[PDB]
Every structure is written in C-alpha cells, then in structure tokens.
Amino acid sequence: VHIEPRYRQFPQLTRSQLIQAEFFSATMWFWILWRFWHDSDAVLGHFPYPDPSQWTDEELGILPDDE
Amino acid sequence: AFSAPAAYLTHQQKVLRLYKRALRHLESWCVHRDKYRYFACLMRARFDEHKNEKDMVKATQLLRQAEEEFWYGQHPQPYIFPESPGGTSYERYECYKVPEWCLDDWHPSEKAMYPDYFAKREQWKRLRRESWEREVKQLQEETPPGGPRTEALPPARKEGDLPPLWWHIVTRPRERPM
Amino acid sequence: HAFFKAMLFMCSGSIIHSLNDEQDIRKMGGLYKAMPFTTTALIIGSLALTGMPYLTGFYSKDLIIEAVNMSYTNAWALLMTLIATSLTAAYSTRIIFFAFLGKPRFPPLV
Amino acid sequence: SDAPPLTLEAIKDRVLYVLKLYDKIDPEKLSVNSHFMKDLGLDSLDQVEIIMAMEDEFGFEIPDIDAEKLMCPQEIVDYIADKKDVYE
Amino acid sequence: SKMELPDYKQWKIEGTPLETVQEKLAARGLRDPWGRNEAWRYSGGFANNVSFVGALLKGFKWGFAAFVVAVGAEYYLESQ
Amino acid sequence: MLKIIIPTTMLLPMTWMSKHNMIWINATVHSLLISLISLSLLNQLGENSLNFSLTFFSDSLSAPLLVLTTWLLPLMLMASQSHLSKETTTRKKLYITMLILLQLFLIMTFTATELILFYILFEATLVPTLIIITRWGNQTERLNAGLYFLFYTLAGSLPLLVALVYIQNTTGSLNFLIIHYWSHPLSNSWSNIFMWLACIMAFMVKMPLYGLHLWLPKAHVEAPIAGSMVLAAVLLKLGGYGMMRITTILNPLTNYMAYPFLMLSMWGMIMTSSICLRQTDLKSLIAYSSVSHMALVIVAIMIQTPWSFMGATALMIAHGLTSSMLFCLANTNYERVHSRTMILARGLQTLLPLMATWWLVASLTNLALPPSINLIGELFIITASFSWSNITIILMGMNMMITALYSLYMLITTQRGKYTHHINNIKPSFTRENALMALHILPLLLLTLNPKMILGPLY
Amino acid sequence: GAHLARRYLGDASKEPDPLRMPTFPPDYGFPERKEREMVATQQEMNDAQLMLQQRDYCAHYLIQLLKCKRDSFPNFLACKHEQHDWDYCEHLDYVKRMKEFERERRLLQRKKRREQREAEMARG
Amino acid sequence: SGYTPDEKLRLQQLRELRRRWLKDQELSPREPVLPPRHSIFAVTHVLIPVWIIHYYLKYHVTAKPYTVVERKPRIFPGDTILETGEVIPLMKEFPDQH
Amino acid sequence: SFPKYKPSRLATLPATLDPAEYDISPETRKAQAERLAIRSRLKREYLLQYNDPNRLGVIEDPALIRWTYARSANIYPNFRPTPKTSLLGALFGIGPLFFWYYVFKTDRDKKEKLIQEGKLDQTFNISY
Ligand SMILES: CCCCCCCC/C=C\CCCCCCCC(=O)O[C@H](COC(=O)CCCCCCC/C=C/CCCCCCCC)COP(=O)(O)OCCN
Numbered sequence A: 001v002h003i004e005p006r007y008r009q010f011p012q013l014t015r016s017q018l019i020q021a022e023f024f025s026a027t028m029w030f031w032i033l034w035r036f037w038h039d040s041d042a043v044l045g046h047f048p049y050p051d052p053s054q055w056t057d058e059e060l061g062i063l064p065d066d067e
Numbered sequence B: 001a002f003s004a005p006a007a008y009l010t011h012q013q014k015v016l017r018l019y020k021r022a023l024r025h026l027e028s029w030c031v032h033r034d035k036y037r038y039f040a041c042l043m044r045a046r047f048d049e050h051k052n053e054k055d056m057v058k059a060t061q062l063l064r065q066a067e068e069e070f071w072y073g074q075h076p077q078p079y080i081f082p083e084s085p086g087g088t089s090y091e092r093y094e095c096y097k098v099p100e101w102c103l104d105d106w107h108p109s110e111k112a113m114y115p116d117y118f119a120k121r122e123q124w125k126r127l128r129r130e131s132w133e134r135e136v137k138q139l140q141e142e143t144p145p146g147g148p149r150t151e152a153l154p155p156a157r158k159e160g161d162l163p164p165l166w167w168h169i170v171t172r173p174r175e176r177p178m
Numbered sequence C: 001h002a003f004f005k006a007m008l009f010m011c012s013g014s015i016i017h018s019l020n021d022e023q024d025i026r027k028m029g030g031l032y033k034a035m036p037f038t039t040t041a042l043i044i045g046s047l048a049l050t051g052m053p054y055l056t057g058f059y060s061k062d063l064i065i066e067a068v069n070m071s072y073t074n075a076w077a078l079l080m081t082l083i084a085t086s087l088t089a090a091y092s093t094r095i096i097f098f099a100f101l102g103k104p105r106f107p108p109l110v
Numbered sequence D: 001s002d003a004p005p006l007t008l009e010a011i012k013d014r015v016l017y018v019l020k021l022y023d024k025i026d027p028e029k030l031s032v033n034s035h036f037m038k039d040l041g042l043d044s045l046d047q048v049e050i051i052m053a054m055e056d057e058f059g060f061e062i063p064d065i066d067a068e069k070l071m072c073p074q075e076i077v078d079y080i081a082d083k084k085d086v087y088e
Numbered sequence E: 001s002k003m004e005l006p007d008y009k010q011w012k013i014e015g016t017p018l019e020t021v022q023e024k025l026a027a028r029g030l031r032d033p034w035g036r037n038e039a040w041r042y043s044g045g046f047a048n049n050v051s052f053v054g055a056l057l058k059g060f061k062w063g064f065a066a067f068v069v070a071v072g073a074e075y076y077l078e079s080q
Numbered sequence F: 001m002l003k004i005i006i007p008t009t010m011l012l013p014m015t016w017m018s019k020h021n022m023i024w025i026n027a028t029v030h031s032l033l034i035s036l037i038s039l040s041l042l043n044q045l046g047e048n049s050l051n052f053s054l055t056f057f058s059d060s061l062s063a064p065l066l067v068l069t070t071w072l073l074p075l076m077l078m079a080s081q082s083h084l085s086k087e088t089t090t091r092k093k094l095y096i097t098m099l100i101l102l103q104l105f106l107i108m109t110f111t112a113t114e115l116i117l118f119y120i121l122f123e124a125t126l127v128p129t130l131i132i133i134t135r136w137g138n139q140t141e142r143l144n145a146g147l148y149f150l151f152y153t154l155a156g157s158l159p160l161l162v163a164l165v166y167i168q169n170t171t172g173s174l175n176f177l178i179i180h181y182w183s184h185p186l187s188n189s190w191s192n193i194f195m196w197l198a199c200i201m202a203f204m205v206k207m208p209l210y211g212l213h214l215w216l217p218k219a220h221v222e223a224p225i226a227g228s229m230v231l232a233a234v235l236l237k238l239g240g241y242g243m244m245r246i247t248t249i250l251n252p253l254t255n256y257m258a259y260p261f262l263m264l265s266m267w268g269m270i271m272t273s274s275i276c277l278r279q280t281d282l283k284s285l286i287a288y289s290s291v292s293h294m295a296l297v298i299v300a301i302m303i304q305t306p307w308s309f310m311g312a313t314a315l316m317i318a319h320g321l322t323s324s325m326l327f328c329l330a331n332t333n334y335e336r337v338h339s340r341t342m343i344l345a346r347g348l349q350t351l352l353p354l355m356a357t358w359w360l361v362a363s364l365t366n367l368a369l370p371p372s373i374n375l376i377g378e379l380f381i382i383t384a385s386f387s388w389s390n391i392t393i394i395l396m397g398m399n400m401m402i403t404a405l406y407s408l409y410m411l412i413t414t415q416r417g418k419y420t421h422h423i424n425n426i427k428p429s430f431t432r433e434n435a436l437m438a439l440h441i442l443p444l445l446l447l448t449l450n451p452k453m454i455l456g457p458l459y
Numbered sequence G: 001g002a003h004l005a006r007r008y009l010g011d012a013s014k015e016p017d018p019l020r021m022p023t024f025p026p027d028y029g030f031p032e033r034k035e036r037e038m039v040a041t042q043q044e045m046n047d048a049q050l051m052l053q054q055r056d057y058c059a060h061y062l063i064q065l066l067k068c069k070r071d072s073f074p075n076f077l078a079c080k081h082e083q084h085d086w087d088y089c090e091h092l093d094y095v096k097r098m099k100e101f102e103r104e105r106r107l108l109q110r111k112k113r114r115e116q117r118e119a120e121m122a123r124g
Numbered sequence H: 001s002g003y004t005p006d007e008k009l010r011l012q013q014l015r016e017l018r019r020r021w022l023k024d025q026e027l028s029p030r031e032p033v034l035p036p037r038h039s040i041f042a043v044t045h046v047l048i049p050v051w052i053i054h055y056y057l058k059y060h061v062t063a064k065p066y067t068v069v070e071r072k073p074r075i076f077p078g079d080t081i082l083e084t085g086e087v088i089p090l091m092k093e094f095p096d097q098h
Numbered sequence I: 001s002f003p004k005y006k007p008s009r010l011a012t013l014p015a016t017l018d019p020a021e022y023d024i025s026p027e028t029r030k031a032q033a034e035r036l037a038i039r040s041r042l043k044r045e046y047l048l049q050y051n052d053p054n055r056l057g058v059i060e061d062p063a064l065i066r067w068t069y070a071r072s073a074n075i076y077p078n079f080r081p082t083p084k085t086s087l088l089g090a091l092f093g094i095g096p097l098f099f100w101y102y103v104f105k106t107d108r109d110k111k112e113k114l115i116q117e118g119k120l121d122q123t124f125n126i127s128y
C-alpha cells in the first residue's frame, strides 16, 4: 500500500481501514446492547431497597411507650 | 543563530520582537484559525495605531506599558515548535551527531569499505590545508589594530580564496545524521 | 486498566508519528475522518476509561465506586473520589474534542 | 516511510505559494528576486507577518535576528535550504 | 510521487468562518490579508465533521442492527 | 602459608632479571598465577581458623582480603604500563618493585597471629605507597599530599604501639588466639578509657573517620593510577580488619565509648555524600564516595553485632573492587585529555560506547543495586543499625538517596550530553583498558553468585 | 444518607452509634426471640477454605456455588442459580442489619422521650 | 535592514561550499564493499527449556522437603476422596427458601 | 493597570520588565560597545585555534582553570577568622553532632529502661 502526500488536501484512504474501524465500533456497540439486554440488573440493581419507615413496631419489638 | 549580534537592540527591533511574541502567544490563546485571524488583525490595528509618534519618550513609555501587559497576559503554556529550544524534540538527534575527525581513527579494514568517500575526504583535507594560511593573512589584514569590534567575518575577495574560518561551518555533521 | 491505558498511549503515539512528531493538541485538527482506526480505538479506550457499562473498565471501576459509597469511610475522601471520577470524563472529552473534532490545524504538508 | 527528500524546487514553490496568498502582494508582479520594501512597498510589520507565515508553512521557527535580514524570497529559500541541509 | 501543488486561485474565503471574520473586520475598518492562506483548512475534504455525540455513536447503526437480528433469532429459537 | 609468600619474593628477582621489553609480561603472568594459588585459602572451617604455624593463620575474615590483594596486583601492573612508557628501564623495575613490596607487606599483614607483628607490617605498608605517590605523581601538590598521608597515619598509630606493649605487660601475650580465649572485661576508669582510645584511633584514622579524612582526597587525587587503586581497594580495609580484631578486648567499655564515633560516622557519611554533589574534579568525587562507604563500615564495626560484621566484610570487599574500577575509568579519560576537570570532556558515550557501558556498570555497583554484594553488605549493616536504634533508618536512608544522585550525576556529566567541539584527540579504546574493566567487573558478579565466601567468620 | 444529616446536624442522642450498637438487651422489646441458626458446619467451612469474612450465615450457598463453579469449569456461564441464591441470602442478611439499625434508632427515641416525659410528670 | 554586501557574499560562498560538502557525502553504487526449518523455533525455545525445567524440578527440587508446597485442594460436601475412598455427607437439609 | 510582578531569588526579573533597559544613556551605549568588543576579541581568539588544521589536542581555557583553582585551592589563603565565620563554623560543625547524640542517647535509654522492666515484646527476636 503506497500512499503519497497531498499538500492541503484530504489524505488518501484505503477501504480496509474504514471497514475495520466501522466493524470494531459496531461490535463494541453490539456487545454493549447485548450485555445490557441480558444483564440489566448489573446496572439497575437486582433486589429492592426497603424503606424502614414502613416497618411495624411489633416487628421491631418496641413497647407502646408505656412500660 | 547564523548572524552576528549587535552591541544593542534599536527601538524598532524591540518593537518588532514584542509584536512577534504577542502574536505567537495570542495564537496560543486562540487555538482556532478564524478567531486567531480576527484577534491578530485587532492586535495589528492596536499596534500601528501609535505608529506615527514622533516623540521617542512617549514611544518608550508605550513600549514599557505594552511589555507589562504582555507579561501579565502571557500564556503559561505557549505553543513551541518541536525543534525549537523549548520543543519536545529539541536536542533529540544530538547523540547521533559524530564529528568528522573521528573518521581519521577508523581501522584500514573499515576504510577499505568506501574508498571513493575517503578519496573525496582527502581532497577536502588538502583544500583546507592549502587555504589556511591565506585565510589567516586575510583576517590579519582586514582587522583593525585595536581588535575586532563585532563577530562578523569578511568574505573571500581574491581569485581563488575561500572565506576565512570556513571548515567547521561547512563540515557540520547534519541535522538528521542517522 | 492495563489494556485500555496501553491502547490509549499507542493511539497517541500513532497520532504523533502521523503529524511529524507533533504532540500539542492545539495543532491537531479533524482526525475523525483522516484516521478512522485510530479514532475508533481512542473512542473505545476513552469509553472504557470512564467506566461505560459492560466494557472492561466497568467491571472494576463501577464496583470500586459502589464499594466506596457503602463503607464506613472518611467523607472528604469519598467526595474527592467522586470529583476525580467526574474530572476523568472531563479530560477524556478534552482529548477527543481537541484532537479529533473540528478543522485541521497542522502544517499543510499532509 | 518518513517525509520525502525535500528539494530546492519544492522550497521555492512553497515559498512563492505562501507569498501569492498574501492579499497585500499582487501575484503577477511578484518575482523570486523582489525586495519586500522597495518593489512591493511593505513595512516591517508585514515582513514579520511574512516570516511567521513561512514558519507555519515549513513547521519550524526562524530566530528574529536572522529573520530581520531576509528581504526577498530568494533569501527565504536559501535560509530554509541551509537550515534543513538541502543541496539538490 | 511526482505531484504538483494545487492552483493557488481556488482558495477563497467564500462560505467559511473566514467570511464572517472578514465581515466583522469591515464593520471596524480593518481587513484580514491572510484568509486565503487558511482557506484550505475548510475547502476540500475537511468541509464538514461530526459532533461529539456523533463521534461517540460511530458504529451504533450496525451494532444495533446485529443486536436486533440476534434477539429476533433468540425469540424464535426457544420455540423448539 | 609460605606457599604464597615465597612466590612474591621470587617475583622480585624475576622482575630485576628480566629483559628490558619483557618485564610487564612476566610480572602480569606470575602475579595471576600467584592469585590462582591464593584462591585455595577460601576453604575455611566453621569453628576455628586455619592455623598454619606459630606465626601465620588464616581466618574467614582475612582470606577474601588476601585474595583481593593478590588479584589487584596484576590489575595495577596492567594500568601502570601505559603512562610509564617513556620511563627508563631501571625506574620501571623500581616501580614494579614498589608494587611487589606493597603486596608482600599486605599479604603478611593479613595473616599475622600476633598484634605487634601486625602493627609492624601495617606500618611498613607506608613506605612504598609514599614513595610511589611522591615520585611518580604528576602535579606539584603530590609532595604535600605525601606529608598528609604520612603524619596523619603516624599520629594515630604511635599511641597504639604504646598500648600494645602495655597489654603484653599485663596479660603476657599478644597472640590473637590467646587474647580471644583469655578475654577479660574492661572496667570504667580513665586509664581504660585512654587505653580504648589508643587502641581505636589508629584504625579510625586509617578508615578514615570523618573529621580525620583530610589526608585522603589529597593522597588519592595526587597519586598515580596504581597508587590510587591500592589506596582505595586494600589499604583502607586495614583499619576495618584491625578494628574487628582489636574490639575483642575492649568490651564492655565499647558501648559507652562508641557514641561520638557513631555520630561522627553517620553525620559524616551525610556530609561527604553531599560534598560529592558539588565537585569539579573527577578523582575527588570518588575519594569522597570512598569516605562515605568507609563511614558505613565504621558504624557496622562499632555497633558490634554478627549481622553488622557480615555486612562490614561484604561492603569492604565490594567497595575495594568498585573504587578500583572507578579510578581506572577516570584515568582512561585523564590519559586522553590530560585534565581532571569533570565538565571538560562531555558526551563520551558518542565516541566510546563500550567505555560508557563500563562506566554504567561501575556507577550501578557504586549505588548498591541488588543483588550485588554492595547491596548485601549495605542492607546487613542497615538492619543491624535498625536493631541498635530505630531512628538510624533516617540517616542511612538519606545516604541511600544522596549516593545514587551523585553516582548518576557523574555518569550524566561524562557520558551523556554533546561532545566538546574542540577536543579532537579521543582515540578509540585499547584492548588493555577494556580488559582491565572486565577483570574488575566480572569477579563482583561471580561473588554475588556465591555470597557466603565474603561474609566473614560470623557466617 | 439522611441519617448522617440527622446525626451531625440533628441531636446526637436520638441517633444510633454505628460503633456502639446495640445498647439495649436483645430480648428487651420482644417477648421471645428465636436463635438464628447456621446450616454449614465449622468443619465444612474449614474444608471449603472460604474466608474469615465469607464464613457468615450465608456460607452454605457459597459452598454450593463454589462446588457448582468447579464442576462446570469450561462453562463459566452455568452457575447462575447458585449465584442468585447466594446473593439473595446476602440481601436478606443486609435487610436484617437494617432492621437492627432501625430497631436501635426507634428504641433510643422512644426510651429517651418516655424518660423525659416521666421526668416532667414527676417534676410537677 | 537586511544583509550587507559583505555578509551576502560570504553567505553565498559558504553556502556553495556547504552544498559541495553535502554532495560529496553520497555513496557510490559500490561503497559498502563487503569482504568475504518451519517449526524449529518451538523446539529450541520452548520444548528444550521445558524439558530441562521439568527434569530439574522432578528429580532435584522435589528430592528435598518443603521445596514445592501446594495449598490443599478444596473439599466440598458430597465429594469423594481418591486415596481413602471416603465420601463426605450432604449439608443439613436446606430450608428451601424457594 | 494590571497586577504587578515581583522578582525573587529563584524567579528573577525579565529583561523586558527591567526599568534599566528603558531609560538608556550614551554612557550605557559606550559600555555595551566595549562589552561587545571584548566578546568579539575572545571569540576571534578561540576561532583562530578551533579552525587550525595543524592543531591536535584540546584548547586550554584560562577561564575554566581559574574557576577550578578558585573553587579548590584559593579558598584557604583568603580565609580570615571573623565572628561570622567562627559562628557559622561552630554551628554547622557542632550542632548536628550533639543533636543526634541527644536523640540517640534518649532513644537507647528509653529502650534499655523498657527492657529492664521486662515489657518490650521481644518474642521471635532471634537475629540482631
Ligand atoms: C591525626 C589524628 C591522630 C591523633 C590521635 C592520637 C590520640 C590517641 C589517644 C591518646 C592515647 C594516649 C594513651 C597512651 C596509651 C595508654 C595505655 C594505658 O592503659 O595507660 C593507662 C594510663 O593512661 C594514660 O596515662 C593516658 C594519659 C594521656 C597522656 C597523653 C595525652 C595525649 C592527648 C590526650 C587527649 C587526646 C584525645 C584523643 C585525640 C582527639 C582527636 C584530636 C594505664 O596506666 P597506669 O598508670 O598503670 O594506670 C593504672 C594504675 N594507675
């Protein structure tokens, strides 16, 4: 592959480098989409985070402010 | 680096040096080309607005104020050409530079390769050996009794003379020796 | 980190060699189209360095950040870690913007 | 490989190319031996701008002490050739 | 090998940011005598370039197409 | 051990009966053969020493020193013959005779069973060195240097002699075996304090101790190349060997007494390392580096632990080899350019690549790169000092930094940069100089391959 | 998080101390409490060489997961169920720790308020 | 401004001399007068070193105690030992939190 | 108009910011001419030997010889015992020694006192 200078013009390009660049960007994006589709919980979490305010006093074993 | 410096700089020389420094640092601040062109034209207009000042005292005061402004507003990280005294490849190829006299120390086996090059080298050495005394005589005659005021050297003036003190300027190693 | 850091330095060296040993980003113009493979390699490396999900940098940096957030730790250290992981994306943006986008700023002998 | 073996003709062509793109100098009347101050009628600031344009074109910087003495394109190309070791 | 420089008269500031810079200079009585030395940075194959988001989503089209066709194959492969 | 002593006394008439153009060859060959013979002394025991007779014995501490001396003699012979080419035959034979006498005195010194015979030989080593310095030195200060080399020594060693004879009037023997077996504690009295000082200060001035070191830069800079090699390689180690021998009778007075010498040694290693950073002469830098290393050895001997003694032995051998190599390296450039200024000749890596490789290896070994025996000795001494007191790691640590700096500084000043333009007589390196460097450097790494041979009797 | 703001800006006494917890008896508010049981024996955990920190109450699921990973070695995508069970056990343990924190918080609040109210009643 | 005639003339003379010197640096076509299988790499660089290393470890290093020490293999409930043949019981009847 | 720059020892004053170079006198011009004449004479003297075809060796520089001699051998002849010299010598050559002696003696006294009471945790301390 012989590529010569241009002097104020866009350089010459061979089809192989565009093909490889586009292919690699494409497989990166495909991998990201496929992994997100199959392992979404790795980003959004898996188990629900509980809110302690909705826990009953009886469950926590606290006397009704009398004893 | 090639020219002999003078005893001092004149007012116009300092003005031009400040102009060049200001333009370069403004380009460092204005990365993109159109913005740089706009602000460089503005700087040129600001610069030649006081171009016709006949009072030298006010001229020097303006120069001093301009230099103070430059020092305040300079770029801490200006663009440097890669081979300039501050560039990232300034003295990169100095280790590859070898002086020519080293070729005298080569083994005759090493000199057996490249016979024509060493024949040409012998021709050059003969030329220098023949020209040395004429160079010394010319330097003696041209120079004043007190001594030489500047570092400038005279050229050859006679029929077959060479410029005095030429050997180490002509036989520079190279810019990209290897 | 080894993978994408080595690759980022390699792409930087490729750019330096192409532009006659020039290293200042202020004299690098539009290399997105002029240098396709280098462009995609640097983009992938930058996205991995910033911890884009499911890339190589994610599987360690994300876990590190969420382990720092959920530990009994110094508060100033946590805040500085967060500010640093923001500045990481900042300087990756700086590199991409100044080196690959825009119009050429290198000498005319391409 | 690396950059081609730059020659004197290329240096002259590029210097003239930069010069005809200066809006203040007309292309037709410009010649290789034209003095910047006498024939084209430029002052010192224009010479400084020309030197910076040359530096940008060839990718290296000329010190001011040397830059002041260059007054016609032939001197510019001679300085460039001497700096970069160009003999052909 | 053996190519000459392009004709110098094709470099114009027409349709470039240099045009707007020149217009703004004319509004102040100044002029820009170096635009034709920069016109080559906008004239040819450097005329247009992508944005930051456009650069990040370089190979998104082909990757999304592959992901969609793979998922479609997976959905009607469990029908065995 | 007459099987090593007699061949040197035979080296004498062989030199004086040789043809005018064969002295160097014969001397070098037979010195190398004597070194090979002396290699047999390394087979040492684990409990006692090799007691050859009533007069001579070999310990695990003295055998590596003997091997180092016998190995150094051919190196000095090789180094000297370049600058003595124009000398007449008789004066060349006299120079070789001085070197042979010095080696004989050192060999007999390192194996004497009695302390008084050790004193006599350790003082007889003065005469050939002084003659060499004051006769075959190059500049005019050499005479002054000789005086500084002489009286500085004698002022320290004359009291020791007195102490020595006094001891023999009290215990009845100066034999090192009887002295070791019949050892008695020293009380805390003024008489015992001054006995301690008399026994110690001679060896202190020989190392030399900081503040008593002013003779060393003069003597090592003004001497010829062989004189410098023997001064830095072996003659400094006499003080350490003598101190390690004599400390067996000074307990327990040593703990109280050592403090000023320990502080002097530590602050002086710091000061001499700092001095090496601003030195315009190349030989003076190497001299002050020697002072720093010997200060470390002084600390090691003074704290008096087994690990410290192993470190002292290893460091002494390593420093001898390294300093001899560095002095030879400097002398090559000096012979080229006839000046000792360090910034005069620059960028020598461009002109002499293999010589630059030798410079790099010598500078690497000077800064104690692992796993060289330099680093082994230094680390053992540092560990012993840390056990002595945890704060010492400060001062030692600082030394480990400064040393490296000046070492690399030397290299960067001589080999890198751009060559001096007007120096146009840098001839290519000879086979003799390269062989000298290789014969200096290879035994160091070979010793690293088997370190127990230079770790002393405490191993 | 809000607890940090409530403690640093909020009254210190009301908020629980992470280093000193619990400060009330385990059976204070409860009439009776079951003792939490452990499935994996000490010998099994020692043989599995789990870790000094992984030997919690969820160690049995971890042992199952490690065995499943070792058995299905080339298929490193086969141990999804066991991983999920171990994660679920860890989640339950963390939820129980949150329960304990909230218990200490509201016990401290109720106790201090009740003591202050009783003091106010007895002070009049 | 500019060169003086003396500087100009000296520049031309030195420049012509320098071009001549640089021209003389070329090499004529004969200047370097020199005076007078497929998978072999995997054998001399992999197989021989591994032979030497394996022999040295098997017959010299192992011949001394505690030279090559391996941590014990992991043992799980339900496993069978090769040497003794003993089996390990199951694990205490999981509560089955399905 | 703009914030000012103050020079220091390790960050000196630029030439363009120097007020001495903006208020010049014919005496200053004569001095500059003399300096240039001296420099040019020295440069010619050097270049005459540098380009000599018959010169083999090094060109001896009297300035370098003077520098080395002044930095090495001219110091003691020009030394006078003054209050400043005596104070600086005493401080820099005495203070560190006693400082380190006090530090090390205190450390070792503490360690010995701790050892005497039998509470130092010297278990496994085999090598010393
Ligand atoms: C270049 C520097 C070298 C100079 C250093 C030289 C100084 C060496 C240290 C002084 C050595 C003098 C001691 C001589 C040998 C003593 C042996 C001995 O044990 O004798 C003692 C006696 O000790 C003495 O008599 C010593 C007195 C000192 C006299 C000479 C003074 C020399 C200078 C002293 C101060 C110097 C301090 C060291 C030098 C510091 C560095 C400048 C016991 O004798 P008895 O009388 O039987 O006692 C028991 C019954 N009553």
Ligand SMILES: CCCCCCCCCCCC(=O)SCCNC(=O)CCNC(=O)[C@H](O)C(C)(C)COP(=O)(O)O
Binding pocket: B011, B012, B015, B016, B022, B025, B026, B029, B046, B047, B048, B049, B050, B051, B052, B053, B059, B062, B063, B066, B067, B069, B070, B073, B074, D043, D044, D045
């Ligand atoms: C980017 C941050 C730094 C930039 C800030 C810089 C600020 C400085 C801007 C203001 C500078 C001035 O105007 S300072 C104005 C100085 N005034 C004079 O010099 C009057 C006398 N004029 C002459 O001598 C000649 O005409 C001469 C002009 C030399 C041309 O010479 P030629 O015609 O023969 O080439």
